[PDB]
């Protein structure tokens, strides 16, 4: 009964949600995410996990500041305001 | 019966009602509606009348 009845015995989550990635990879008994490396400082990445990088990298989100960075570089990082020509 | 921020608590609700509606409030029972919101059942003293102040507000 290594198959079906054991799958019936299967009901306790090894993994739950993580607060840095939100992916349900936070091993409770180790206290680590299997995807971001929480609660470590760094973010978990590998150059064999190219797809993983591509999935979790810059630009898959809002870039709440970084789009405006390039706009602002174009305008030369200016202070002040307009003058009502 | 009010719909309420998830950041709020019973002291806040009681004081806010006393201010906005010029009433006194006996007790407060809150819950989280599974649409994500908070709901508050707010019981006053027997002095005031909830019907009166609700059809004063302009809902009924």
């Amino acid at each position: 009964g290594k198959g079906t009845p054991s799958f019936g015995k299967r009901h306790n989550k090894s993994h739950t949600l993580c607060n840095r990635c939100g992916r349900r990879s936070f091993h409770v008994q180790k206290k680590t995410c299997s995807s971001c490396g929480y609660p470590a400082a760094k973010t978990r990445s590998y150059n064999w996990g190219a797809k993983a990088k591509r999935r979790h990298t810059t630009g898959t989100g809002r870039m709440r500041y970084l789009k405006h960075v390039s706009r602002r570089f174009k305008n030369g990082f200016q202070t002040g305001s307009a003058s009502k020509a | 019966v009010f719909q309420v921020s998830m950041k709020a608590n019973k002291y806040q609700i009681k004081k806010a009602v006393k201010e906005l509606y010029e009433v006194d409030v006996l007790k407060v029972n809150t819950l989280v509606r599974p649409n994500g919101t908070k709901k508050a059942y707010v019981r006053l003293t027997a002095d005031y009348d909830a019907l009166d102040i609700a059809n004063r507000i302009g809902y009924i």
């Binding site: 949600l17 349900r24 | 989280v32 509606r33 599974p34 649409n35 994500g36």
Partner: protein, 50 residues
């Protein structure tokens, strides 16, 4: 379960607000390519995995 956590309940509420069909005025708008919802989710068929 009954004894649950607020995060779970939060995600559940969001799911419940997602689980309903398209608006037909969106079906009416200009240049529209949407006919139906395809992010639709039913407890019998697929689980959230949370």
């Amino acid at each position: 379960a009954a004894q649950k956590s607020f995060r779970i309940k939060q995600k559940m509420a969001k799911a419940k607000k997602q689980n309903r069909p398209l608006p037909q005025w969106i079906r009416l708008r200009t240049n529209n390519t949407i006919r139906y919802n395809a992010k639709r989710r039913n407890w019998r068929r697929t689980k959230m995995n949370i």
